[PDB]
Amino acid sequence: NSIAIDRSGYYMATTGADRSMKIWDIRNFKQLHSVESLPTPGTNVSISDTGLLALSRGPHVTLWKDALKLSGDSKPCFGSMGGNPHRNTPYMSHLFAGNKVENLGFVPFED
Amino acid sequence: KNSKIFSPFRIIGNVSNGVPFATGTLGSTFYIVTCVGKTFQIYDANTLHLLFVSEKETPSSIVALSAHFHYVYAAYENKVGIYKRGIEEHLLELETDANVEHLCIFGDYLCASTDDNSIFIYKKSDPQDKYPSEFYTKLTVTEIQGGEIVSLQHLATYLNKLTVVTKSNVLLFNVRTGKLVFTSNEFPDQITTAEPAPVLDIIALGTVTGEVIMFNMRKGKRIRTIKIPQSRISSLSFRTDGSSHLSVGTSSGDLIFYDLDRRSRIHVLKNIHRESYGGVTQATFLNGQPIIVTSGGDNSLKEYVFDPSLSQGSGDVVVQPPRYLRSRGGHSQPPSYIAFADSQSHFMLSASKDRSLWSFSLRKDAQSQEMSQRLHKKQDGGRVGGSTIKSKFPEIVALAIENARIGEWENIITAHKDEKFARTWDMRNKRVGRWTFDTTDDGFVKSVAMSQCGNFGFIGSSNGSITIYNMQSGILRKKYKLHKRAVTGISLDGMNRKMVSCGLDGIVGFYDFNKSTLLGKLKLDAPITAMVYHRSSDLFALALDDLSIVVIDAVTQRVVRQLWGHSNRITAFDFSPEGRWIVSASLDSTIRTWDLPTGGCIDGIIVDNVATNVKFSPNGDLLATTHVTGNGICIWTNRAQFKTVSTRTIDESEFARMALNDIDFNTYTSLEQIDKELLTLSIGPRSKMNTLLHLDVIRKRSKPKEAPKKSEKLPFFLQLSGEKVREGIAHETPEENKFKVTGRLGFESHFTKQLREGSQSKDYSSLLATLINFSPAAVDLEIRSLNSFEPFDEIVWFIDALTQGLKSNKNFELYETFMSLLFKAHGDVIHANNKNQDIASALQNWEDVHKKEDRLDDLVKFCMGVAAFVTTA
Amino acid sequence: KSDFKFSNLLGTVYRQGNITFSDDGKQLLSPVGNRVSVFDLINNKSFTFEYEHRKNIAAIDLNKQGTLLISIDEDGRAILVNFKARNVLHHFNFKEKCSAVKFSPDGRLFALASGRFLQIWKTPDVNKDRQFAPFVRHRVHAGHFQDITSLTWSQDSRFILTTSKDLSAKIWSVDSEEKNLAATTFNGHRDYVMGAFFSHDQEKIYTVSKDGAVFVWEFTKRKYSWRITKKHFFYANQAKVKCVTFHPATRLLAVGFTSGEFRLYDLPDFTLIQQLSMGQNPVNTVSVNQTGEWLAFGSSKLGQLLVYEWQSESYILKQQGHFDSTNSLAYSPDGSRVVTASEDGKIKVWDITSGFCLATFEEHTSSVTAVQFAKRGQVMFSSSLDGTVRAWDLIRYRNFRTFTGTERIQFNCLAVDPSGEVVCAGSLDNFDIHVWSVQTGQLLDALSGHEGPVSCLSFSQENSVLASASWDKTIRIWSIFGRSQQVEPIEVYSDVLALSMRPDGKEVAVSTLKGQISIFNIEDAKQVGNIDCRKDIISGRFNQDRFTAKNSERSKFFTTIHYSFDGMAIVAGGNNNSICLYDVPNEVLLKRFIVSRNMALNGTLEFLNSKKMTEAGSLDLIDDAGENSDLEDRIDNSLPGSQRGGDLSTRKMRPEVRVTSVQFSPTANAFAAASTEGLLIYSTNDTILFDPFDLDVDVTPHSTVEALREKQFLNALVMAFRLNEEYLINKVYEAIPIKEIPLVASNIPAIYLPRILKFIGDFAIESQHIEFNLIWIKALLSASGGYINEHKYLFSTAMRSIQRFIVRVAKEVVNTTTDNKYTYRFLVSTDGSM
Amino acid sequence: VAPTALKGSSRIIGINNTFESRKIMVPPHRMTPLRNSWTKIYPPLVEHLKLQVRMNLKTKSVELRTNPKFTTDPGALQKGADFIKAFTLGFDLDDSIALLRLDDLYIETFEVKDVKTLTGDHLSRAIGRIAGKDGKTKFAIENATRTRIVLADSKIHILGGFTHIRMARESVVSLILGSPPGKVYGNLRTVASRLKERY
């Protein structure tokens, strides 16, 4: 469905219709993470200059911080089971109640 | 009281009867629940669009309404119903004869207050149950404890406390334990309203002498007092949009807004609702919004909105006054006249004693609108004469509408009470027209009619003159003077040729509108009160003074039917669209349906309230009636539109105590055969003969031009290998010996058994029955499969079977067809062995019968020869 | 008299949506644009419902009991209909694009595919009275991520299979207790899942995708789960699956591809039974009979409908309709059949009762503009813009002659001699009228005198003069037959658009551009009447119009008019949304008929919703073709300026509601109007109206029956007519014994003679009492043969109906009888040996 | 089973095939076809029908017996016996499997002498007329009527549905009795179509 690449050209995030999001290493072409089951297919993905990973699933918009890393603990998670520090829960979320998100774009030099 | 032709559908024009409405929230959205007599309606707060109505009418009028998320609680008599989406989910029946008064729901507790100062508590059986069902306990407040209960309120953050508010003072009950936690100090003035504030522990109390008290329940002391001398509080509500505003509604119809922080009055909205109907019965701020929804007993629901301040700073000081946002409404008093605006059942025109004319929509309530009374500037240029203070036009006694020229010029005429002219209106613009029609004889207008072309308007005066105006230019054209008393009816046929009139003198005038001549005059026994003309059938009925309806044919000017049975004055009546029924309402509280073809009362109803008006939809699907009480219009559905209705006369004596089948259902089924000697075709499609004769050629046409491609590896028995239905001749199973060509016993077809059985019994009636039933492919297959080898028994039997059929003279076209197929398939066999005695005798007997059926040819030839000659020369 | 109701729609058998067979399999329900048409194939009868959506129908279903029909348009607007009573029970707006609706095989529930949600509702009871909210929701399911393509019910009404554009198929349980039984999602398809079905045992689930793959799903060990045990592929080169249906009992899979060819497969083996092609256009819908024997396919582009009996490889039904093409219509002289001329260049003969095309003729290259029968009826003539007039022989269906001008003139109007010996055509570019001899085919002469294009022509049946009109603001009466050639011009205030000739031949009416119908006396050449029609006409605002409908003068006139055969009424239509029926002697509008209520047509609404208007303009005018998923839909083949004469893709503008032709039925009180959607036929057949004639108090249905019991048959019959009740006339008619028919027939009053003859003609055609009806006709003609002659035009339709009964059904019976007599004599008499 | 699952007459006619036991005798000319085809005959009988199967070499006959502890269908013995006879009469094995699989397939058996007492060359011509050159006439009858015919000298065995073999029987008899070839072929065209039609 969507492809996003970071500024450094080192990481790539891809979403598929199989409800899966995969983070890639496009210098060495090694898959880093595979979030196999998403609640719904992700329509868009974007990566900011700081490295925030943004995902949109219909009306939902979810952000993760430090997802683009080789470490296993950095894998995106939606919820920490019992407050496990290693699990990388979403950095921010927002719900557009009745709207389906069309596309995502980070404003270049603004938060 | 149950009709066999009509059933209630709903009530139009009602928004609220005055019971305080209930506001519920689903998510971000809001909805309002209003009471309409014995039913409630749910509106969408954002659009005021009707969403749901209660599925059934309650036995008694609803006294209270409370809504929480999807569920709505409606209290009536001693029972509390729980509704979801307008459908009852559970009915709570209290064990005392006292009627419920107030209703409070917090948490899993449902609190119902009866008129005897008894509070019943119900609780959820399960913590996750949607609504409370189980009866928990009963708390009764005695006169020493406090006065009559004014309302039940629950304050937030209170565990299992119910704040009972009485006229004397406020009481705090613990529902879980059923004990009085606290009693407030007595108040000098009678409390009338209570409302929990958005602040903690504080409830706003409104007294009978214009005092609003911010009572603090925790401290048990007064916090503030607003004074509104010479006013009675009916509603209270706080603003939750971050501005400390308080709205006070009064029985005088005024809504005051205070600023609690500033101790000042923001504004007052004067006469938003009529005092005579209870003023402002309910006024509630929408949670977290600047919108306030107001209601009253005048059948109206309004919304007002606070605009943002116009000052960039000090916005709290510069407060914009509230602005009207949207509203819905209807008549404040029962409608006096109703009519159908169009051929479809979309719109209705209604007029009421409140001096307003409304256009009501059956299809959607939001489309209902009030017809404007703003006047058009006079064409002459002089100033129109009227009082500067604007008032509504008087009550409308009569109305007449046409749609032949809608959008071109005025298409409605109305007659007013004690007024010497008729006003015109325009349906397309929804505004009063620019013409006014005067009687010109110093008499009041009693009758209005319009021609079907929409070019003429007829006005009947109380002094007996009929004036005729043109609707486009409003110029008087003709004036007829025959009646000496009031003209109570005028009508003109569809062709605009013959005009009819009736009056209180009892004469019926027949005029020629084209030539302006008096065709005839008919005098009836009693004064005539009303007229309805049916243009398709040229019949009109007259409601006479002697409690009769007299149906007259305009073409021949003679009474054709006269209807008796009403015990009092006939208020209204109407023709069914097909011209076959008359439904009339009378002052004896009965609606009777009369069948003109037989001239008898086929149905009767007993209405609680006398029906003033009766009107059929031009489609015939709906019947509209208005009653002496109630601001709405009762819509009934015509069950005759989905099933036949018996025209057997209704029992008169039985009806008073409450206060040939083919002819009865207006149908006739043709006989199978009128007479044995008469030739009769088969009862079926006439193409069956042609299909049987030409089966092959029809089928060669049917085949596709190119052969379908198919797989080489195909099951040989695919057609038989079907998981299980097919009833074809192929799918026949044998029913339970030496070999026989036709069929060995136990393995022969059904058809061959019947043929052999018939030959022995000397009767092929059973076989002829199955031949007629056989499909064309099956018939050809059986005849082709007949035994064609000596001694030729089956062919002889088949000829004998067909010969017997021809004797019956029924289904003869098929027996001729079967014989033709026999010659087609076995003609060579018959030709080769024509000398055989068995075949010859069977053939000869067939000829003797077949020779008789040549009379049909003689009839057929004669009719063409004469019919061709008659039509040509 | 003027009580006409919409009866059926000819010319179109399928427009879009899904066609459903009846449970009995004996009726086919086909959406025809804005309405639903029901064809009874065994009885050879058809009818179209009167109710009407505001947009085209998208999905329909009929419950197994056959009592309730639900139809849904493209906006989600639904109408529930009582099938037996043909009345509307309720209107429901589902506020979304409902792709499919299906009744449960029990009938208690029906399901809806509305976007990505599956809605299950409770079926209202047909016996119950109408109420405000008849439907009761049962559940809403939201598991799919994109729109649901279709849904399927299990045979036990316990499970539902839904297929979506998510490349997925999903199963639901109707009962919440059984949710664990079926909560599975089926993945693995590359394209949209077009259909998912259960096997008869319900242990095998088949899914089909648009790419052309069929997956077999089974509950098996790898502990048990649904798995794809087998995968089959349609190796269609580029065609994509367009529709699929499965019959569990016969294990038949019918798949329709976008290339226009369909295949029948046997599952789970995947054996190809048959492969056929209905054309080059996609197969939009496919349906199966309950028995599994008949397969119905429909193609939207050409409006084809096809029922295929795959067992015998025969066509039960094979029809193609017209949209926006019919230019003209003509009734057969007996009224049995109606012919149409279309812009395709094809002439089609339609059976009124059946609703199907009997024959098609494709000789003409260009649009056929007019068609007309000879007085005899055996022969037909048609003119076309290709420059030719062609004569057709219906006995042998040969174009036995073709007439052509010397200078290559397009012909727009036509007229035929009542003797059938001279044919005249007019044109919009020549200003002359060409005349040919039918026997020779030679151009007899070219009539001149018009200063403008000839708009219309008509021969008078008796005096045989020719009346022509033109945009020259004049009418000319030509006495072509006779030793002397005379022309009588009559001036008119404005351009003449249509012309009709009285059956008497003594007057001619013309519709002008001012919106007037003026009647002239031919012999005296003076006006005798005038009808003003501009106010009556309903003209709607087009979406592209920048001016109001009131100020619009696009079509406030009538382009076609026809008389009733009695001579007392005119039916008129034009490029507008009204068919107006006027009464000539009184010059009044008897009734007006709205042609269409379809917002898909352009001229329907006088006022347009201001919400659609924006700063850009109307939202409707924005072209959303690029949204369409298939390349064929996106392609734009429109020529920049075309108005007519091409396929709908060429125009780029919405179809506009208009009536091209109108005529009265020669044999019945009905008229047919060629319009954009099809041939609307309005008839008075129902006759629920109570229209008594000369009643008195003593006349009653009870008194009528009493008269029969007393054997006063003449008094009983006359009293029945005065009531004018069909059931009472029928009851009296069949109770009169044969011996006393001639006595009654001689004594019937002359006033009621037209009524009895009308009843016989309608009754006899479909009745079984052939001999009884012929006896009555013989008695009536013999007794009152002279009276019918003196008034030919009062009895014309009644007489024609009687002749139809005597010729079309009575003759066919004796013809089959008489050949048996001769076949008999030959077999017995001759010598059969060796 | 899936979670969505729903909650002794002899077919052969003209010959008497009849803890229960059935015995069928195999003629010598079917011994070798039985041997090379036996590997496909016992599986369906012992697995699907749950019968006990055996051939007796001493009597050259095949024995079927119902096993009450395993057999469940009361009719299985008769269906298995009717299967075995069809192979015995001369039908191909896959043609014989249809009897086990279907429940409405019946074998019609009769002799030429039953139709007419033909002898010498008259009998031989009758068998020729039924068979035709290269078996064309027999091929046509089987295809039109959707049946399977085995023409063993003067003995004819017709397998198919009831109405189907009823039509094949008439066609064969007309060929025996000498009806013109054209009338038979034309009738074969009609019965072919008329059988497959719904109406």
Q: How far apart, in whole angstroms, are the C-alpha atoms of residue C597 and residue C599?
A: 6
**D190 and B784 in contact by Cβ < 8 A?**
yes
Q: What is the DSSP letter of D13?
A: B
Contacts of C378 (CB under 8 A, 6+ apart): C393, C394, C395
A51: left (phi over 0), alpha (psi -120 to 50) or beta: left
Query: How many residues belong to chain B?
Result: 873
Contacts of C3 (CB under 8 A, 6+ apart): B536, C684, C687, C689, C691
Three-state secondary-structure class, residue B851: helix
Which among C42, C181, C293 is the nearest to D4, CB-wise?
Answer: C181
Three-state secondary-structure class, residue A57: strand
**D14 and B744 in contact by Cβ < 8 A?**
yes
**C156 in D contact zone (CB under 8 Å):** yes
**B7 in C contact zone (CB under 8 Å):** yes
**C202 and D5 in contact by Cβ < 8 A?**
yes
Helix or strand (DSSP H, E) at C326: strand C326-331
Structure tokens at B717: 């028995």
Cβ(B89)–Cβ(B71) below 8 Å: yes
Give me the sign of the Cα torsion angle B829, B832, B833, B834: positive
Q: How far apart, in whole angstroms, are the C-alpha atoms of residue B222 and residue B240?
A: 22
**D199 and B776 in contact by Cβ < 8 A?**
yes
Q: How far apart, in whole angstroms, are the C-alpha atoms of residue C56 and residue C703?
A: 51
How many angstroms separate the first and last alpha carbons of chain C?
69
Q: Which of residues 173-232 of B touch C (CB under 8 A)?
A: none
From the CA of B807, how many Å to the nearest CA of chain C?
15
Give me the sign of the Cα torsion angle C59, C60, C64, C65: positive
Structure tokens at B681: 């075709």
Give the phi and the psi of residue C829 in degrees, each rounded to 5.
-75, -45
CA nearest neighbour of C658 among C741, C717, C575, C763: C575
Give the phi and the psi of residue B433 in degrees, each rounded to 5.
-80, -175
Residues paired with B162 in a beta bridge? B173
Three-state secondary-structure class, residue B528: strand
Cβ(D77)–Cβ(D22) below 8 Å: yes
Q: Which residue of D has its CA nearest to C292?
A: D198
Q: What is the DSSP letter of A76?
A: B
CA angle C677, C678, C680 (to 5 degrees): 115
Structure tokens at B227: 């004074």
**B683 in C contact zone (CB under 8 Å):** yes
**C814 and B857 in contact by Cβ < 8 A?**
yes
**B498 in C contact zone (CB under 8 Å):** no
Chains that touch D (3 or more CB pairs under 8 A): B, C
Asked whether D and A share 3 or more beta-carbon pairs under 8 angstroms, the answer is no
| Cis geometry, peptide bond prior to residue B704 (ω within 30 degrees of 0) | no
**D146 and B733 in contact by Cβ < 8 A?**
no
- Would you tell me how many other CB atoms lie within 10 Å of the CB of residue D89? 19
Which residue intervals of B634-726 are DSSP H helices?
652-658, 661-664, 687-693, 695-702
B-chain CB neighbours of C291 within 8 Å are 725-726
Best residue in D194, D195, D196 for a mutation probing chain B (most B CBs within 10 Å)? D194
Which one-letter amino acid corresponds to residue D137? T
Cβ(C325)–Cβ(C661) below 8 Å: no
Resolution number, Å:
3.0
Structure tokens at B857: 């040819």
| Cis geometry, peptide bond prior to residue C134 (ω within 30 degrees of 0) | no
Per DSSP (E only), the strands in B697-825 are none
**Domain edges within chain D:** 19-101, 102-198
Q: How far apart, in whole angstroms, are the C-alpha atoms of residue C346 and residue C327?
A: 11
Q: How far apart, in whole angstroms, are the C-alpha atoms of residue C16 and residue C34?
A: 10
Distances (CA, A) of C75 to B594, B782, C69, C608, C610: 43, 53, 18, 17, 19
Q: Which residue of A has its CA nearest to C190?
A: A17
The DSSP string of C619-661 is STTS--GGG-SSHHHH-----TT--SSS-HHHH-S-----EEE
Q: How far apart, in whole angstroms, are the C-alpha atoms of residue C450 and residue C432?
A: 7
Three-state secondary-structure class, residue C675: strand
**C187 and A58 in contact by Cβ < 8 A?**
no
Q: Which residue of B has its CA nearest to D173?
A: B741
Three-state secondary-structure class, residue C727: helix
Q: Which of residues 136-195 of D touch C (CB under 8 A)?
A: 193
Q: How far apart, in whole angstroms, are the C-alpha atoms of residue D162 and residue D11?
A: 10
Q: Which of residues 163-192 of C touch D (CB under 8 A)?
A: 171, 180-182
CA angle C300, C305, C307 (to 5 degrees): 140
Helix or strand (DSSP H, E) at B761: helix B750-761
**B703 in C contact zone (CB under 8 Å):** yes
Cβ(C683)–Cβ(C797) below 8 Å: no
Q: HSE, CB side, 13 Å, CA atoms: give it for residue D149.
A: 31
**C820 and B820 in contact by Cβ < 8 A?**
yes
Helix or strand (DSSP H, E) at C458: strand C454-459
Structure tokens at B344: 């479809």
Q: How far apart, in whole angstroms, are the C-alpha atoms of residue C150 and residue C97?
A: 12
Which one-letter amino acid corresponds to residue B671? L
Structure tokens at B389: 């203070």
**What is the rounded (10 degree) CA torsion for B763, B769, B774, B779?**
30
Scored b (16 or more CB within 10 A) or e, A2-40 reads bebbbeeeebbbbbeeebebebbeeeeeeebbebeebee
Going across the sheet that includes A44-47, the strands are A44-47, A53-57, A60-64, A92-95
Distances (CA, A) of C145 to A54, A57, A100, B208, C193: 20, 10, 11, 59, 13
Three state DSSP letters for C105-154? CCCCEEEEEECCEEEEEECCCCCCCCCCCCCEEEEEECCCCCCEEEEEEC
**C87 in B contact zone (CB under 8 Å):** yes
Chains that touch B (3 or more CB pairs under 8 A): C, D
Query: Residues preceding discontinuities in chain B at C–N > 2.5 Å?
Result: 659, 724, 736
Cβ(C393)–Cβ(C379) below 8 Å: yes
- Burial class of residue B761, CB neighbours in 10 A (0-12, 13-18, 19+): exposed
**C159 in D contact zone (CB under 8 Å):** yes
Q: HSE, CB side, 13 Å, CA atoms: give it for residue C260.
A: 12
Q: How far apart, in whole angstroms, are the C-alpha atoms of residue C825 and residue B848?
A: 13
**D197 in C contact zone (CB under 8 Å):** yes
Q: How far apart, in whole angstroms, are the C-alpha atoms of residue C143 and residue C185?
A: 9
Cβ(C60)–Cβ(C31) below 8 Å: yes
C34: left (phi over 0), alpha (psi -120 to 50) or beta: alpha
**D4 and C155 in contact by Cβ < 8 A?**
no
Give the phi and the psi of residue C256 in degrees, each rounded to 5.
-110, 125
Contacts of C713 (CB under 8 A, 6+ apart): C707, C732, C735, C736, C737, C740, C744
Rg, C-alpha atoms of chain A: 13
**B859 in C contact zone (CB under 8 Å):** yes
C-chain CB neighbours of A58 within 8 Å are 145
Structure tokens at D5: 């699952």
Structure tokens at B17: 């009867």
Q: Which residue of D has its CA nearest to B717?
A: D146
Q: Which of residues 593-632 of C touch B (CB under 8 A)?
A: 606
Strands B570-575 and B558-564, sheet pairing: unpaired
Cβ(C27)–Cβ(C39) below 8 Å: yes
Contacts of C752 (CB under 8 A, 6+ apart): C718, C721
Structure tokens at B557: 């000017």
Going across the sheet that includes B282-285, the strands are B282-285, B291-296, B300-305, B323-329
Which one-letter amino acid corresponds to residue B344? Q
Contacts of D89 (CB under 8 A, 6+ apart): D107, D109, D150, D152, D157
Which among B663, B686, B850 is the nearest to C701, CB-wise?
Answer: B663
Three-state secondary-structure class, residue B698: helix
Asked whether C and D share 3 or more beta-carbon pairs under 8 angstroms, the answer is yes
**D177 and B721 in contact by Cβ < 8 A?**
no
Distances (CA, A) of C563 to B411, C327, C568, C670: 30, 19, 7, 12
CA nearest neighbour of C387 among C345, C417, C448: C345
CA nearest neighbour of C632 among C150, C282, C193, C195: C282
Which one-letter amino acid corresponds to residue B624? A
- Would you tell me how many other CB atoms lie within 10 Å of the CB of residue D38? 13
**C145 and A58 in contact by Cβ < 8 A?**
yes
Three-state secondary-structure class, residue B696: helix
Best residue in D97, D141, D149, D166 for a mutation probing chain B (most B CBs within 10 Å)? D166
Longest CA–CA span in chain A (Å) reads: 41
**C40 in D contact zone (CB under 8 Å):** no
Helix or strand (DSSP H, E) at D156: strand D155-160
Helix or strand (DSSP H, E) at B553: strand B548-553
From the CA of B680, how many Å to the nearest CA of chain D?
25
CA nearest neighbour of B431 among B505, B370, B489: B370
Which among D101, D115, D148 is the nearest to B741, CB-wise?
Answer: D115
Q: Which residue of C has its CA nearest to A18?
A: C187
Residues paired with C198 in a beta bridge? C205
From the CA of C173, how many Å to the nearest CA of chain B?
24
Cβ(B45)–Cβ(B678) below 8 Å: no
Chain C interface with A: residues with Cβ < 8 Å: 145, 166-167, 187
C-chain CB neighbours of A41 within 8 Å are 145, 166
C754: left (phi over 0), alpha (psi -120 to 50) or beta: alpha
For the range B308-316, what are the long-range contacts, defined as Cβ-Cβ under 8 Å and sequence gap of 24 or more?
B316/B243, B316/B259, B316/B261, B316/B262
From the CA of A18, how many Å to the nearest CA of chain C?
9
**C312 and D5 in contact by Cβ < 8 A?**
no
Give me the sign of the Cα torsion angle B176, B180, B181, B185: positive
**C817 and B816 in contact by Cβ < 8 A?**
yes
Structure tokens at D184: 């038979």
Distances (CA, A) of C787 to C759, C784, C791, D167: 18, 5, 7, 62
**B697 in C contact zone (CB under 8 Å):** no
Q: How far apart, in whole angstroms, are the C-alpha atoms of residue B437 and residue B422?
A: 5
Q: Which of residues 675-714 of B touch D (CB under 8 A)?
A: 696, 699
**D57 in C contact zone (CB under 8 Å):** no
Three-state secondary-structure class, residue B772: helix
The DSSP string of D127-147 is HHHHH-GGGHHHHHHHHHHT-
Q: How far apart, in whole angstroms, are the C-alpha atoms of residue B42 and residue B13?
A: 14
Cβ(A42)–Cβ(A49) below 8 Å: no
**B579 and C690 in contact by Cβ < 8 A?**
yes
Q: How far apart, in whole angstroms, are the C-alpha atoms of residue B66 and residue C794?
A: 71
The DSSP string of C181-244 is TS--EE---SS-EEEEEE-SSS-EEEEEETTSEEEEEEEEE--EEEEEEEEEE---SS--EEEE
Q: Which of residues 298-337 of C touch B (CB under 8 A)?
A: 311-316
Distances (CA, A) of D107 to B546, C599, D163, D173: 89, 64, 12, 16
Q: How far apart, in whole angstroms, are the C-alpha atoms of residue C750 and residue D129?
A: 74
Structure tokens at B375: 């006047």
Three-state secondary-structure class, residue B683: coil
From the CA of D57, how many Å to the nearest CA of chain C?
39
Residues paired with B512 in a beta bridge? B498, B517
Residues paired with C169 in a beta bridge? C163, C186
Contacts of B568 (CB under 8 A, 6+ apart): B547, B586, B587, B588
